[PDB]
From a paper:
Of the known factors that promote muscle development, TRIM32 is an intriguing candidate for coordinating metabolism with cell growth. This protein is a member of the Tripartite motif (TRIM)-containing family of proteins defined by an N-terminal RING domain, one or two B-boxes, a coiled-coil domain, and a variable C-terminal region. In TRIM32, six Ncl-1, HT2A, Lin-41 (NHL) repeats comprise the C-terminus and are proposed to mediate the diverse functions of TRIM32, including cell proliferation, neuronal differentiation, muscle physiology and regeneration, and tumorigenesis. A single mutation in the B-box region of TRIM32 causes the multisystemic disorder Bardet-Biedl syndrome (BBS), while multiple mutations that cluster in the NHL domains result in the muscle disorders Limb-girdle muscular dystrophy type 2H (LGMD2H) and Sarcotubular Myopathy (STM). Our data show that TRIM32 promotes glucose metabolism through the stabilization of glycolytic enzyme levels.
Causative mutations in human LGMD2H cluster in the NHL repeats, suggesting that this region may mediate protein-protein interactions important in disease prevention. We previously showed that mutations in Drosophila TRIM32 also show progressive larval muscle degeneration, despite modest sequence identity (~42%) across the NHL domains. To gain molecular-level insight into the functional conservation between the NHL regions in fly and mammalian TRIM32, we obtained a crystal structure of TRIM32_NHL at 2.6 Å resolution (Rwork/Rfree = 18.2/22.8%). We then used the TRIM32_NHL structure to construct a model for mouse TRIM32_NHL using SWISS-MODEL. Indeed, the superimposition of these two structures demonstrate that the NHL region of Drosophila TRIM32 is a faithful model to understand NHL function. Briefly, the C-terminal region of Drosophila TRIM32 containing all six NHL domains (AA 1061–1353) was fused in-frame with an N-terminal Glutathione S-transferase (GST) tag. To this end, we expressed and purified His-tagged Aldolase (Ald) or His-tagged Phosphoglycerate mutase 78 (Pglym), both of which were low or absent in control pulldowns. Both Ald and Pglym were found to directly interact with the NHL domains of TRIM32. Collectively, these data demonstrate that Ald and Pglym interact with the NHL domain of TRIM32 and in vivo, a subpopulation of these post-translationally modified glycolytic enzymes can be found in a complex with TRIM32. Another possibility, which we favor, is that the NHL domain of TRIM32 serves as a scaffold for the subcellular localization of glycolytic proteins to limit diffusion of substrates during glycolysis.
Author numbering: 1062 to 1353
The structure:
Amino acid sequence: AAGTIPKQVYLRKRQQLFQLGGRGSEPGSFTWPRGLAVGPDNSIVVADSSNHRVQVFDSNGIFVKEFGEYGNGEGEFDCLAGVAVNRIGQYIIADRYNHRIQVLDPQGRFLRAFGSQGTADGKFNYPWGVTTDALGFIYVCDKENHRVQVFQSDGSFVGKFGSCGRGEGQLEHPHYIAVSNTNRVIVSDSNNHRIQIFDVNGKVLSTVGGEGSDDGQFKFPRGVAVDDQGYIFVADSGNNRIQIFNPDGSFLKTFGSWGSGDSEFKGLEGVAIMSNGNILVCDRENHRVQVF
């Protein structure tokens, strides 16, 4: 991989390499998938929301394992949306309709849960959307509280930031986030049609994009990912596009349109980026994950 020019790789993005899913509840099928994440060896981890489960695939698409079932018990999920994998390989699920986070081990066995519905510190309204920083700190978007709450690996509350509003440092219904290896917190601020970037302590660092349909503009951004150089990847759901941004925030590339064939989307949700430049998009109403 030594001579790779990332910018050139990203600018060639359009044609799907392969896809995953198809409607159903058997292993390898999805129902209305929302969050996805990449794992250690570039594994593809899918929040299979309406099947109340996570499914894990290797970097070439081969199904590996699934875990979870409907419920409010330990290791059960109501209608999960967000998923993530930390450096230790344990699975971190935003169990949306139970208003809690569950952390499972690399084999999908239950380790701990935390949170319940509420506005208070450590309490969530509709969690939807989670990620991990290098030290194992958990960052949640509780969508309906218009904020980001950060926890320790054991669930201990640590801090929070953002609040309802349309201004500097505010959020309206944020769905998805990512933390870069620079420890900048990258929040898709859905209804403000913008990407918000904070440091770990809640200080606004910059803003990417704004409302519109031109290059560099968003209509209801959903999934976000960041690569190891700071390229930012956005599911521009309102405009039926993936957008890619240079590490300085400037528009680089866009691809996709409303549809259900190769490179077409309906209901863009989560987004993830493999360390080889493969972009992963969750295509909710087509019950599939597409890889570019």
